[PDB]
Amino acid sequence: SHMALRVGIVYGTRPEAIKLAPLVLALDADPGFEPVIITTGMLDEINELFGLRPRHNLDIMQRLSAMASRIVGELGDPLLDELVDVAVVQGDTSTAFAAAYAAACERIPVAHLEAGLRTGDRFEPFPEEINRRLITQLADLHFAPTADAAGNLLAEGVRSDDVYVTGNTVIDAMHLVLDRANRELDAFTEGRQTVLLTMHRRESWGIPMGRVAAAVAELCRSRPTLRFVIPLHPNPEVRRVFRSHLSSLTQVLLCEPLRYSEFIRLMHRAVLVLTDSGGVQEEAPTLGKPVLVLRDRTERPEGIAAGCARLVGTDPALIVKEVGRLLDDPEAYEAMRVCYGEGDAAARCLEALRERWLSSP
Amino acid sequence: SHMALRVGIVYGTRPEAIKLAPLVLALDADPGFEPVIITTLDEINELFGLRPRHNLDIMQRLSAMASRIVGELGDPLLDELVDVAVVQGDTSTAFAAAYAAACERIPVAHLEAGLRTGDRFEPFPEEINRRLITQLADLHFAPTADAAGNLLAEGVRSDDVYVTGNTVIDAMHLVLRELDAFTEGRQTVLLTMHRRESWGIPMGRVAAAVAELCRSRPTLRFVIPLHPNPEVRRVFRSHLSSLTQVLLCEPLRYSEFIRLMHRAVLVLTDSGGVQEEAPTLGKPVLVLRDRTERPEGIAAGCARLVGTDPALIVKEVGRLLDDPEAYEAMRRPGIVCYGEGDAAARCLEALRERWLSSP
Amino acid sequence: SHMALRVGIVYGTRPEAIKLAPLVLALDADPGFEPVIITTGLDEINELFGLRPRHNLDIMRGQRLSAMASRIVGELGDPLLDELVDVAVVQGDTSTAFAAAYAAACERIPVAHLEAGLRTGDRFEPFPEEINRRLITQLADLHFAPTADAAGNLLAEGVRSDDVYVTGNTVIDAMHLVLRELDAFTEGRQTVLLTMHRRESWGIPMGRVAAAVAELCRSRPTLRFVIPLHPNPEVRRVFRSHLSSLTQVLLCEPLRYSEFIRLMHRAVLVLTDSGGVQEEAPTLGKPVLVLRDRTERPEGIAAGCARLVGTDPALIVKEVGRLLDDPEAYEAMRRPGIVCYGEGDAAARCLEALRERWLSSP
Amino acid sequence: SHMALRVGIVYGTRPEAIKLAPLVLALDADPGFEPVIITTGMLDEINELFGLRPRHNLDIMQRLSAMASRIVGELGDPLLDELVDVAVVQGDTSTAFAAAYAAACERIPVAHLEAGLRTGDRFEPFPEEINRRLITQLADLHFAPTADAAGNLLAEGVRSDDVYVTGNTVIDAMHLVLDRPGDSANRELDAFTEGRQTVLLTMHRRESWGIPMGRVAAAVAELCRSRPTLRFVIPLHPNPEVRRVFRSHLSSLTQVLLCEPLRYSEFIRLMHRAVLVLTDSGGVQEEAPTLGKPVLVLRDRTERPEGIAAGCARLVGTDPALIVKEVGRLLDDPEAYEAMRRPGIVCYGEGDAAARCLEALRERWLSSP
Ligand SMILES: O=c1ccn([C@@H]2O[C@H](COP(=O)(O)OP(=O)(O)O[C@H]3O[C@H](CO)[C@@H](O)[C@H](O)[C@H]3O)[C@@H](O)[C@H]2O)c(=O)[nH]1
Ligand SMILES: O=c1ccn([C@@H]2O[C@H](COP(=O)(O)OP(=O)(O)O[C@H]3O[C@H](CO)[C@@H](O)[C@H](O)[C@H]3O)[C@@H](O)[C@H]2O)c(=O)[nH]1
Ligand SMILES: O=c1ccn([C@@H]2O[C@H](COP(=O)(O)OP(=O)(O)O[C@H]3O[C@H](CO)[C@@H](O)[C@H](O)[C@H]3O)[C@@H](O)[C@H]2O)c(=O)[nH]1
Ligand SMILES: O=c1ccn([C@@H]2O[C@H](COP(=O)(O)OP(=O)(O)O[C@H]3O[C@H](CO)[C@@H](O)[C@H](O)[C@H]3O)[C@@H](O)[C@H]2O)c(=O)[nH]1
Ligand code: NA
Ligand code: NA
Ligand code: NA
Ligand code: NA
C-alpha cells in the first residue's frame, strides 16, 4: 500500500523489448517502483521469455506522419488512465519520439534508455537519427551506455546532472538468457565453422542486400567446410532477396527470427558475426566474436576504436576478403577479440530513477 | 413477483460510490425496491457488492462531458425501466443525470442535498451543480438542519426535504500490515489533499508544513494516501519522499482508510467526506481550505479552517499535540453534526412515503 | 477601436426574437456594446427589426428534448469562444435559453436573463418551461425582471437583491416600434382575435375552444373571428376541421409582428394562451381571456385586465358574451393610465444594468 | 517559366504573421523564389495590411496533443499538393513545431526564422521553450536574430555553417508600416493621446492570467490616481479572461483607454507616441527600443537578454509596488529615462533581416558546387 513510482514503459519492436526487459524486471522486483508497459506494435515471444505483461496494446503500427499523429493523439489517455508518474522510452524509434512527446504534453517526465548514440550523418538513417535528437530535448533523464554517448548528450546542451553512464541493458539481457535449446541449429553448426549474419536496414533493401548474399554465395563456393546461419528480418522483400540468392546452398541455413535465448546461444557458437544490427554490435564483442558491420557508418564507434568491429559496408569483394582474413589468419582473428557495460545497467538505471524521482531535500 | 420501485443510481466517482453504497444495500435488502446502477471504482463496487447494470465510458471539456451524459443516459434509464432516479453530491454526473432523468419525466431524489459555502461558482462547477440539482430534484435528503435551511432559501417546499443525516456515517459503520508496522506505538497524523484550486504552490506549502512538523517532532508520523492525479503525487513525492517519518501511500481501499483514520491522533484534509468521517471517530480535523460546506463541525468545535498557510498549520497541529485541553475541546461528545448512521433507512422511508403510497 | 462589451444573444423562436429585438437595437446603437446573435432554430422577424445573426446552429426541429439540449450544450461553446463573447443574454423559458446559459457557464461566460422571475407555482407545468426558468435563475449572474412580483419570485429562489433589476418587459418596447384581405374581412364588424398553441392543449382541449368559437358564431351572426394558426400541423388540423366552413371565421397563416399588432388594435377582445399577447393586449386596452388553467402574468389578473377561462366551452361562450353585451363589464377589463408590464423603456434599463455590472470598476 | 524554389510559409498567429510578412514579401519580389502560405489558425487584418494571400487555411486551432496530432496528420497533404521544396516556420508555436515535423516526414527541408532564443528555464513557458529546442533539431537552416542566439544554437550541437545571424524580421516589419502615416492614423486614439503622456501596455501570457494580471491592472490604477495627467492605452489580447481582468479593474478610469487589438500600423504609431512601454510581448521588447522607448517587461524572465544587458529593458514581473516605482522613476527623472535609450548598441538588427534570410536560402538551396 506504500506509494510506488509508476514507470511507463513504451515500445513497439523486438530490439526495444530486449533492451527494456532487464529494466522492467528490476522495476517489478523493487518495492519502490511499478512498471506499466504500453505497446504500440515476435513481441509476444520476447514478452513470454522475460515475463513482460503489457497493460495496454495500442494497435497503431504506413505513412510516418499518420503513425506519429496517432501516437501523439492517443498515447496520453492510457498514460493518464494508468496514473503513470514517469515514462521511459528506449532507442531511436518513431514510437520512442512520439511517446516522449505525448508524455511531455501531459507534463509526465521522460527518461531515455540508451541515450546519446550518434553517427554524425544528418537524417541518416531517416527518421532514426532525428528521433534521437528530438527525444534528447524531451527527456529529463538520460541512461547513456558509454562515456562517448554521454559526451554526445552534453554537446546537445544536456546538463551533466541529467546524464548517467549506466552501460547498455542488452548486456543484462544477454546474461539473463546465457544462464538458462534448438535441435536443428545444433545439428547444422556442430563441428563446423559457422558465420552468423543478420541484415535488416531499409537503406540496404534490394541491390545492397543482393551484394551481401552474393558475398555469402562466393565464400560458400570457395570454402566447402564453412556454414552460415541467417535469421531473416520479418519483411517479405528482405526474405525474398536472401531466399532467391541462397535457398539452394546446403551450407546456408536461412531461419525464421530466433527466440533471443536461442539467438544468443547460436552467436556464442559462431566463429564470427556479419550484421547491420546495433544490438548485435554490442552482443557479439561481449561473447568475444569479431564483428564485420554491413553499413557505411555505426553508432557503436567504441567497438571500431578497440578493434572488436570493422566497417565492411555492402561491398562483396571487401566482405569476401575480410571474412577470409579472419578464417585463415589466427593473428587477425585474435586482434578482433568491456565497450558497452558490465551487465548491471538495469540496477544503475533504477538507482538514477530513485535519486531523481524518489528523493526529497 | 410483486412490483418493485426501480431506483436508478447514477455516479462516476469514489466519493459518490461510498455515499450511495449504503442506500444501494438498503434498496437491495428491502423487497419494495430494486436498485439499478448506471456508472459514467471497481475496488469500491467489489467491497460493498455494487453491480452496475451499465457503464457509460464518458468521463475532457466540461461541455463535452455534460453533452454526452444529457445525450446518452436516457436510453439505459428507459431500457432498465427506471421509475425514480437518485443522484448524490455535487458532480457534473449528478447534474447531467438529473437533467437526463427529468427529460424522460423520471422523478429525481438528491442524496446529500443543501450543502453551500455561499461563494458563487467556488468551486466551479460543483457549487452551481448543487443549485441546478436542487431545482431538478422532487425529493431532497439533507444531512443536517443547516442544509435543509439552505434548500428552503432556494424555494424548495418543506414537504420535499427530509433531514436523513449523511450516509457516509452508515458507510463507515459497514467497514468498521505495512500501515500497522509504520503507525504501531507512534502519534500518526492522517493527511489527504486533492482540490484542484490547491494544486501546485498551495499543496507545496502544506507539504512544507508537514516537513517542518517532522523535523521539530522526531516521534511524529504522517500517513498521506495520495489522490490519483500525477501533479498531486509529484508535489508530495518531491517534498516528502526522503522523510522516514512520512508514509506516502497509493489510494487505500475504504475499509483500510477508515481503520487508519481510527488509529490517527488527528486528520488534516480538504476532503468533504473526511470532514464528516473524522469527527465520527472522535478525531480533531484541521481543514486545508479557506471555506467549507461542513460549517456544523466548525460551529461545534470538531473542525477548524487552516487553509494552506504553513505557519498556521504548524501552530494548529502543535497546539493539539502539546495541549490536551485544546485536543479534548475538538472531540467533546454530545453534539451530533452529520447523523447517527441510519441515513440509508431514513432515505428508504422517504422514498416509500413519496413513491410507494396512494392517498 | 475602443473595447466594446461583446454581448452574446441566443434564441431559437419568434417570441424570443420579438422580446430580444429592442435589446439588440439598444446594444447596436450604444458605442460601449456589440451584440453577437447566435440562433439555434424567424427570417421575417430578423428582417423587420434588422437583426443579423452571426451564426445559425441548425439544431432545432420532431426531436427528443435530451438530444436537442445535448447538441446545444455540446456545440454552442465553439461560436461563443470564436466570436469572443464577454457576456451572454438569454430570454424567457425555452430549452435554448437553459442549454445556452449552461454552455456559456461552462466557458465561464457570465449570463444575463431577460424576462426573469415569471412563475405559476405549478411544478413542471408546463414541462419543460417551468423547470427551464428555475435552472436559468441559478445560472444567471444578472436578472431583468419585468415586474416587482417577478423580482420577488427570484429572491425566494435565493437570488441576491443586487443581481435583480426591475426593467419592465421589452415586448412593450417591441410593440411601440411597430405601432388588405384582413381589412376586407373585418370592415364594419366586431372581430375577436384568437391565438392558441400550447402543447398541453393539443387535440381535445383545442377542439373545445373551436366548438366555443362555432357556438358564438351561430348565436351572433355579426361577430367575426381572426385565428392566426401556430405552425404545427395538429393545431392547424383541429381549427381547420372545426371552423373552415364558417364564413364568420378567418383562419390565417402566422402574421408578421407589425400586422399582428395592427389586427390586435382593431380587435374588440383577445382570446389567447400566449404569454406575450397577455402583455401586448392590455397595453392596447383590449380585454384578454386566457385559454389556460394558470398564468405567469398574475399582474393582469389582479388588475382585472385579464381573466382565466381555460378550455371550458360554456365558460368561454359566457365570458365572451358578457364583454360583447355589457359595456360596463368591457370597461372593467381596461385600465388606461396604469402599466402592468413596463413603460416601453425596458431595453434602456437593461443596457444601464449591463454597463453598471460589466463596464464599471471599483 | 524558370524553376522557382517553392518556400512553404506556415503560421497560425499574429506575432508569426508579422515576423514572416517581410520574408514573404522578399520571396514574392525575388524571381528565384515563390512563397506558399498555409495557415493553421485579427489574422485577415494582418494579411490585408502586408498583402499576404494564404493558399490553404487548415482550421485546426483544445488539448495540445489533439492539436499537434492534427497538424502532424494533416499538413503533409497541402505541402505535397503545393509542391513545396523548402518550409519556413517562425518562433516558438506548436504550429511551428508540428509543421516542421510534418515537413520532415515528407523529406521537405526546414528553415527556422528567429532561432536560438533561450531563457535557460526548462519547460518555462510550456510548451514554447521545448518547441524551440525540437524545431532546432529539425531545422537544416537557422536564422538567428543576434550573436547571443547563434551561441545558444551551437551549444545544442548545431553546426556553425547552418546558423546565420540575420537579425530579427520584426525590425523589417516596423519599417514597412512607419512609411504609411495615412494607414497608421486612428481618430479615437489621436483624440485620447494628443497632448498627453501616454503609457502603452500589452499583456497576454497564459502564466500571468488571473491574479498576476490583476496586480498589473492595480499598478495602472495606482499610477492613474497619483498622476492625473498620465494616460494609458491597453489593446487587449482576444481572450475573454484577459479582457475581464483589465475591464473589471480599469473600465471606469477616464485615464485608461481599453482597446480592441490594433492594426500593426496603428500599434507602431501609438508606440512611437508613447513615453514608455510595459509589455510581456516578445516582439514589443524588440520594437520599443528601436523607437527609443524604455521597456519595462511584465515577466520574471526574458528570451531578449540583449535588451536587459544593454539597459534598453528592465524586468519588473507582476509586482505592483515595483511597477509603480519603475514607471515613476522614468516619468520623473530624465537621467533615468535617457539611461534606457543610450545610443551605441543595436540589439535585434538594422531591418535588413528578410534580405539576409533570402541570401542564406539561395546559398543553401539554389546553388550547385
Ligand atoms: O533472430 C534474431 C535476430 C536478432 N535478435 C536480437 O534482436 C536485437 C536487434 O534487433 P534488430 O531488429 O536487428 O535492431 P537493431 O538494429 O539492433 O536496433 C536499432 O533499434 C534499437 C531500438 O531503437 C536501437 O537501440 C539501436 O541503436 C538500433 O540499432 C539484438 O538484441 C539481437 O540479439 C534476436 O533475438 N533474434
Ligand atoms: O485513500 C483514500 C482517501 C480517501 N478515501 C475516502 O474517499 C472519500 C473522499 O473522497 P474525495 O475524493 O476526497 O472527495 P470529497 O472531497 O470527499 O467529496 C466531494 O464530492 C462528493 C461527491 O460529489 C461530495 O459529497 C462532497 O461534498 C465533496 O466534498 C471519503 O469517503 C474517504 O474516506 C478512501 O477511501 N481512500
Ligand atoms: O400571428 C402571430 C401570432 C403571434 N405573434 C406574436 O408572437 C409572440 C408570442 O408568440 P407565442 O408563440 O405565442 O409565444 P408565447 O406563448 O407568447 O411565449 C412563451 O415563450 C417566451 C420565450 O420563452 C416567453 O417569454 C413567454 O413567457 C412564453 O409564454 C407575441 O409577441 C405575439 O405578438 C405574431 O407576431 N404573429
Ligand atoms: O494591438 C496590438 C498589439 C500588438 N501588436 C503586435 O503584435 C506582436 C506581438 O504579438 P504577441 O501576441 O504579443 O506575441 P509575442 O509575445 O510577441 O510573441 C511570441 O510568439 C512569437 C511566435 O512564436 C515569438 O516570435 C516570440 O518570441 C514570442 O514572445 C508585435 O509585433 C506587436 O507590435 C499589434 O499588431 N497590435
Ligand atoms: Na515493484
Ligand atoms: Na430489494
Ligand atoms: Na454598439
Ligand atoms: Na518571387
Author numbering:
A (entry chain G): -1 to 39, 44 to 63, 67 to 185, 190 to 346, 351 to 374
B (entry chain C): -1 to 38, 45 to 63, 67 to 183, 192 to 374
C (entry chain D): -1 to 39, 45 to 64, 66 to 183, 192 to 374
D (entry chain H): -1 to 39, 44 to 63, 67 to 374
How did the manuscript describe this experimental structure?
Here we report a structural and functional analysis for an epimerase, KasQ, that primes KSM biosynthesis rather than the previously proposed KasF/H, which instead acts as an acetyltransferase, inactivating KSM. Our biochemical and biophysical analysis determined that KasQ converts UDP-GlcNAc to UDP-ManNAc as the initial step in the biosynthetic pathway.
Despite this, the structures, not least the one with UDP-Glc, are still in a position to provide a structural basis to help elucidate the mechanism of the epimerization reaction mediated by KasQ. In view of the KasQ–UDP-Glc complex, the UDP portion is well defined as it is surrounded by an array of highly conserved residues, His209, Leu267, Ser286, Gly287, and Gly289. The hexose moiety is held in place by a group of highly conserved residues for its recognition and epimerization, except for Arg12, which differs from the corresponding residues in other homologs pointing away from the uracil O2 atom (4.6 Å); the guanidino group of Arg309, which is associated with Glu291 (2.9 Å), is in close proximity to the C2 hydroxyl group (4.1 Å), and the terminal carboxyl group of Asp97 is in close proximity to the C2 atom (3.8 Å). These residues may act as a set of the interlinking acids/bases triggering the elimination/addition reaction for the epimerization of UDP-GlcNAc to UDP-ManNAc. The C4 hydroxyl group is interacting with both Lys17 and Gln95 through hydrogen bonding (3.5 Å and 3.1 Å, respectively). The C6 hydroxyl group is likewise interacting with the carboxyl and amino groups of Asp97 through hydrogen bonding (2.5 Å and 2.8 Å, respectively). Importantly, the carboxyl group of Asp97 that is located on top of the sugar plane relative to the C2 atom (3.8 Å) likely serves as the general base to deprotonate C2 in the first half of the reaction, yielding AAG and UDP; the Arg309/Glu291 dyad, on the other hand, acts as the general acid, likely protonating AAG to afford UDP-ManNAc, thus completing the epimerization reaction. Q95 was found interacting with the C4-OH of UDP-Glc in contrast to the histidine (H) counterpart in homologous 2-epimerases, which is at a distance from C4-OH of 4.5 Å. Despite the fact that KasQ exists as dimers in solution as well as asymmetric units, only one UDP-Glc molecule is bound to one protomer of the dimer.
